Amino acid sequence: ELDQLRQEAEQLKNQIRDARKACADATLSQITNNIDPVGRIQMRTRRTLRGHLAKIYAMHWGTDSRLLVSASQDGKLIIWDSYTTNKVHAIPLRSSWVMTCAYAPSGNYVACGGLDNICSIYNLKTREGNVRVSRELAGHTGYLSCCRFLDDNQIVTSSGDTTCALWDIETGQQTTTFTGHTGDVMSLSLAPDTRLFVSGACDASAKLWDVREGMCRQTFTGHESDINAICFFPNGNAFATGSDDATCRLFDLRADQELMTYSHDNIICGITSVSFSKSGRLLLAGYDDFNCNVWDALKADRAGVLAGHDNRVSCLGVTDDGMAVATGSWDSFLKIWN
Amino acid sequence: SAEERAALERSKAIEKNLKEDGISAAKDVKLLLLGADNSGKSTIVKQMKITGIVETHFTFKNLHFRLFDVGGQRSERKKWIHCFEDVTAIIFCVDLSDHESLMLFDSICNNKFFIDTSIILFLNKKDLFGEKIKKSPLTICFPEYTGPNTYEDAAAYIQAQFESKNRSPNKEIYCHMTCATDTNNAQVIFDAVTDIIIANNLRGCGLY
C-alpha cells in the first residue's frame, strides 16, 4: 500500500498547488503600484541600551510599549525601560545558552529558553520582590527556539525537536503538542486573537497551527532556505516570514500563498528578524549583513536602512503603539529607532 | 524625578552587578566537546569528574575550564553552533576502536565562525585500535591507505588525514593519543588551552 499512499499524497499535493494557482488572479504589486510611496523613512536611533555584555539573541516588548525584555548569551535577561534607558530587572539564568525570550501581555511573567531544552517562566510580581523561576517547562528534546505567551497560564513554545508545544504554566504540562515540521522549528508568531499561530521551521516551510484543537491547518512554502523569523500582519490575516535565503516573503492566510518577496540583488545575507509596523505598511527586517532594511510592505521597495549595528542583528520588534522600533544585535547593543 | 531617582539608583546598582558578573564569568575557559556518537566524549568528560547541553566544569592548575558537551543536541548543528563562537577551543574526540567523524571535523574546522578557534583532536581507544589492527587491516576504514598495518603508522596516517582538513593560516590543530585510561588528558588540555590563550591574546593585540 506504500505505492498507493505515495501516489495519493502526490495527487493531494498537486491538487493543493492547483487550487493555490486558481486562487491567484493578481499580484500585490499589480494592485499597490498606483498608491503613493512612503518616501524615505529615515529612522534615527533615539536610545541605545548598552547593558548586555554578549550577543543579544532575543528581545520582546511589553504590552505598554515602554518596557522591553532582552535575553543575551551572557546568562542575563534584563528588562528595559525604553523611555529612560533604565534597567528594572536583571534575571540571572541557570543556563546561558538562551536564544528566545517573551514578555507576558499582562506584564507579570517572563519566559526564556534555549539549548537547555526547557522553557523557564519567571514571576516578576513576586511578593518577596526578587524574580523567581515560577516554572521550568521540561519535555522538549531539542533547543527551544521561540516562546510566546497567550495569557499568564498558557504559553506556546517552538523547539528544535521539530515540534511546537502548548503548555500550561500552572500544571507544567504540554496541553497540546504540535507535530508536522520535518526540521528544526526556529521561529513562532501568535495571532493577535491568540487563537492561531504560525511557526517557521528550518525545512523552508511555515505551518499554521490552531492553539485549541492542535491540528495544522495550512502549510506555507516557497522559501529556499531555513526560515529564521516570522511575524503576523497586524490585522492577523497575513504574515511575513524572513529566511536565510536573503529574502523576506509575505503570505496570506486566506489566499494560502505568497504575495510578495522582499529581495534586493545587493542583499545576500539572510534575515534574522522580521516585524511589521502598527499600520502594516512597513516590514522592518533585520539582516545578518549588520543592517536592517525598512520594506514597503505594499510595494516591496526599501524605504530606509537602519544601519548602525556593528554586528548581525538578531531580533527586532516595534512597540504596541508603533512609536518605536527596537533592534538587538550580536554587538550587545539594543537600539531604539524612531 | 520624584521617585525616578530611586529607579536610576536601582538601574545603576544592577548595571554594576552585571559588570561584576561579566568580569567573573570572563575568567573561565570555554571549550566545546564534539565528535561522533559514543566516540568517547562521555568517557573523557567523566574521567575528569563533575538531553540538553551537558555543561561540565573543573579547575586545573589555576584555570577554570568549562566543557560544553553538546552531544545531546540531536538536531541541525548550524542553527546553534554560532552560539559557541567565543569558546577558547573545540575539544574533538575520536574513537579509534571504530571515518564518520572526518566529515564532521571538516565541517567544524571550516565553519565561518570557527576560522579562529583552535580544534583540539583527541584519539581515544588506542588499545582497542591496536586490537582491531591485529584482527583486521587498518585499510578497511581507509582503502587508500597504502601503508603497513601497524599502530605507529596507522595512527599517524589517521592524524594526518584529520589535520589535512585545516585550511586557515591562523589556526592550529593539536593532537594527542589516549588509551581511555590515562589521567594526562587534563594536562594535555591545559597545554593546548595555554597555547591558544597566548595566540588569541596576541591576535587581539595585533602582534599575531
Partner: single-chain antibody, 230 residues
C-alpha cells in the same frame, strides 16, 4: 511569608538614645528601600527616615535630620539619639522598592511603641472624621500645597488604610493604581491638587483611619487623616 517585625519599645528619659532594629524576612531586604514611619499617640502618620538599596541615598525628616540616623543580615537599624518629648510615637517599619510599575510602601511592619518621660508639600484633609454606615459609599478628600502631577505624567498620591489596632496597608499607589490584595471596592481619583479616595460597598474591615501621602519630593508629608468611624 513576608515580614517586618521590629523591637525597641520601652521608656526613655529625656535626652536619651536608642538603636531601633527592624527584623526583616520573607523578601530580598538588600534589594528594597526601607522607610520608617511613626504615629503620635493621637495624631497621624509622619515620615521619619529613608534608606535605599545599597545605602546609596539616605533622607531624614525636618524634625529628625541629624538626630536620627538610619542604617542596615536582613536587619535595618535606625540609630536614634537625643530623644525629646515630641519623639514619643509608634514607629513603623516600611519597605519600598522603586522602579517602573513598582508598589512602594506596600508592606508595613507591626510597629513599635516608644515613650519619653519651608518647601514642604503639606497635605490637608478637611474632614477629620466621617460617620458612615456599612454598605454605603464613602469618600475622603485630600489636598496639596503644590501640584503632584510631575512632568513624567505620574501623580504621586498614596493612600493607606489603618485599621484600629493594626498596621497600615497600602490601598492605592500613584493615585490610580490598586495594590495587590486590596479589594476592588476601593478606588481613587484626582488631578494636580485635589484627590479623592472612593469606597464602595463598605464592610466592617474597611473601618479605620485613612491617610493621604505624597511622594513628589522628600519629605514624604502625610495628611492629617480621616477617621471613617463606623
Amino acid at each position: 511569608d513576608v515580614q517586618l517585625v521590629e523591637s525597641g519599645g520601652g521608656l526613655v528619659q529625656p535626652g536619651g538614645s536608642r538603636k531601633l532594629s527592624c527584623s526583616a524576612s520573607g523578601f530580598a531586604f538588600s534589594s528594597f528601600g526601607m522607610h520608617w514611619v511613626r504615629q503620635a499617640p493621637e495624631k497621624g502618620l509622619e515620615w521619619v527616615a529613608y534608606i535605599s538599596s545599597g545605602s546609596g541615598t539616605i533622607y531624614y525628616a525636618d524634625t529628625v535630620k541629624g538626630r536620627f540616623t538610619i542604617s542596615r543580615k536582613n536587619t535595618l537599624f535606625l540609630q536614634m539619639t537625643s530623644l525629646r518629648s515630641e519623639d514619643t510615637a509608634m514607629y513603623y517599619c516600611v519597605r519600598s522598592i522603586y522602579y517602573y510599575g513598582s508598589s512602594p510602601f506596600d508592606f508595613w511592619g507591626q510597629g513599635t511603641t516608644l515613650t519619653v518621660s519651608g518647601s514642604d508639600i503639606v497635605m490637608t484633609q478637611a474632614t477629620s472624621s466621617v460617620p458612615v454606615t456599612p454598605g454605603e459609599s464613602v469618600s475622603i478628600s485630600c489636598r496639596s500645597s503644590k501640584s503632584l502631577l510631575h512632568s513624567n505624567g505620574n501623580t504621586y498620591l498614596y493612600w493607606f488604610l489603618q485599621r484600629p489596632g493594626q498596621s497600615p496597608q497600602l490601598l492605592i499607589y500613584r493615585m490610580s493604581n490598586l495594590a495587590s490584595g486590596v479589594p476592588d471596592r476601593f478606588s481613587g481619583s484626582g488631578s494636580g491638587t485635589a484627590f479623592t479616595l472612593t469606597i464602595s460597598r463598605l464592610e466592617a474591615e474597611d473601618v479605620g483611619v485613612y491617610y493621604c501621602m505624597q511622594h513628589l519630593e522628600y519629605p514624604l508629608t502625610f495628611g492629617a487623616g480621616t477617621k471613617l468611624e463606623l
